[PDB]
Amino acid sequence: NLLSPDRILTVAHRGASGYVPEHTILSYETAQKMKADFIELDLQMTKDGKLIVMHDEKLDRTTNGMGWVKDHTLADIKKLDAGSWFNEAYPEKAKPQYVGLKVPTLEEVLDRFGKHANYYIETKSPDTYPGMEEKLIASLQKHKLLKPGQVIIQSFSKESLVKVHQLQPNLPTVQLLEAKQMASMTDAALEEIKTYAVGAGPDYKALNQENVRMIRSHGLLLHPYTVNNEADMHRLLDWGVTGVFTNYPDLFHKVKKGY
Ligand SMILES: O=P(O)(O)OC[C@H](O)CO
Numbered sequence: 001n002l003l004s005p006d007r008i009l010t011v012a013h014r015g016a017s018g019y020v021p022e023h024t025i026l027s028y029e030t031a032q033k034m035k036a037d038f039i040e041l042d043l044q045m046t047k048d049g050k051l052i053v054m055h056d057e058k059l060d061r062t063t064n065g066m067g068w069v070k071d072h073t074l075a076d077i078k079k080l081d082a083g084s085w086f087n088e089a090y091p092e093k094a095k096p097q098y099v100g101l102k103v104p105t106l107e108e109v110l111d112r113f114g115k116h117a118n119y120y121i122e123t124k125s126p127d128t129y130p131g132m133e134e135k136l137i138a139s140l141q142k143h144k145l146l147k148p149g150q151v152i153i154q155s156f157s158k159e160s161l162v163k164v165h166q167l168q169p170n171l172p173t174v175q176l177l178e179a180k181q182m183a184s185m186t187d188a189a190l191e192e193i194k195t196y197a198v199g200a201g202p203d204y205k206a207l208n209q210e211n212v213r214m215i216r217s218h219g220l221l222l223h224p225y226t227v228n229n230e231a232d233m234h235r236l237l238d239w240g241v242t243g244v245f246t247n248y249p250d251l252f253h254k255v256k257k258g259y
């Protein structure tokens, strides 16, 4: 049902990150309240091997810390402020309750929502953080998450998704595509994506009616990122995408009602 081509999915990009600091429990809670179908997680691995949720490989942008995630322990990362950066970046959206928000672990996110959320979880190329895929899988099993569609695994790395498809054939994967990858996409490339992935997630800027219909022609779900503008939401849905990654899940929830 969640994986039905005829279902339009709201994927809350790093949670309700248009309103709340990205990849915090509060961002995910807000996305839930806004009726997002999926909350979206990016994984990094700490020095002591723990999976945390963070978009960048470095702490710099979204915390009061500095340096690579993999050079720091979980304990030190849990001391950081992962909310104040948002108040500084977006003064007009700032809220006092964002000061002191924490970096969550994957464990903390699964524990917080259990089966009450659907998870859209990004892995890296296998060489980046050895053991990440296996640890992710074991965490999903711990929380009894492995309803097909309860969890989708996404990556820019084909190798990662191929590996995941090997280990857990019934675990839906989505191939992420950069703009220039999508720009030069072929039918040959799409048909093999279908062999391990249930969908494609391209930079929406690279989409047009033609390659949208082409992607859909291979029975692939289609979730472009990152779609924040109402005018773009409408255009992409009329073209035939089956969902979006958005920072504004309430807005997309409203728009998609007409499609
Ligand atoms: O957020 P970006 O810019 O890394 O684009 C990928 C989206 O998160 C979809 O995974």
Ligand SMILES: [Ca+2]
Pocket: 040, 041, 042, 122
């Ligand atoms: Ca992502």
Ligand code: NA
Pocket: 059, 060, 061, 062, 063, 064, 065, 085
């Ligand atoms: Na900072």
